[PDB]
Design an enzyme around this catalytic site. Sequence first.
Site, PDB file in Angstrom:
ATOM      1  N   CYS A  39      42.275  37.026  40.024  1.00 20.90           N
ATOM      2  CA  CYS A  39      41.096  37.004  39.164  1.00 20.90           C
ATOM      3  C   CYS A  39      40.387  38.348  39.300  1.00 20.90           C
ATOM      4  O   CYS A  39      39.684  38.597  40.282  1.00 20.90           O
ATOM      5  CB  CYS A  39      40.188  35.842  39.552  1.00 20.90           C
ATOM      6  SG  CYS A  39      38.579  35.832  38.746  1.00 20.90           S
ATOM      7  N   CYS A  42      36.444  38.261  39.089  1.00 16.77           N
ATOM      8  CA  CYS A  42      35.868  37.741  40.324  1.00 16.77           C
ATOM      9  C   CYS A  42      35.408  38.857  41.247  1.00 16.77           C
ATOM     10  O   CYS A  42      34.449  38.677  42.006  1.00 16.77           O
ATOM     11  CB  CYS A  42      36.888  36.875  41.057  1.00 16.77           C
ATOM     12  SG  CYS A  42      37.294  35.320  40.254  1.00 16.77           S
TER      13      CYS A  42
END
Length: 115
Positions: A39, A42
């Site tokens: 991710c 993130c």
Amino acid sequence: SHMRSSFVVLKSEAEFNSALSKARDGSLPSVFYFTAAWCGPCRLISPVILELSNKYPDVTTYKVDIDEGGLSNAIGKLNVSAVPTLQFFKGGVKKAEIVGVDVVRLKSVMEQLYK
């Protein structure tokens, strides 16, 4: 920069269980940062967590990489279904959750809960 002990990278489910017991039974102010290596967005959150740790030194933040061995069971224990997810504990109970990238809200929730 940051204080070393205030940001903890959990590596095993046993470590996660220990941290969650600190946040519940121990009533310690705790933030769980659910993320994944795959991710990209993130990663925007980690620098802000570290920046804020100096303002709220009683808080410990735990990084939970759900792509790590065993830590895949953490999303079931705290009802996580997206990354990034931040969960905030105070007084032994869950006080807030931020799903998705929302840095403005992260700053505001930390102040609201832990000032």
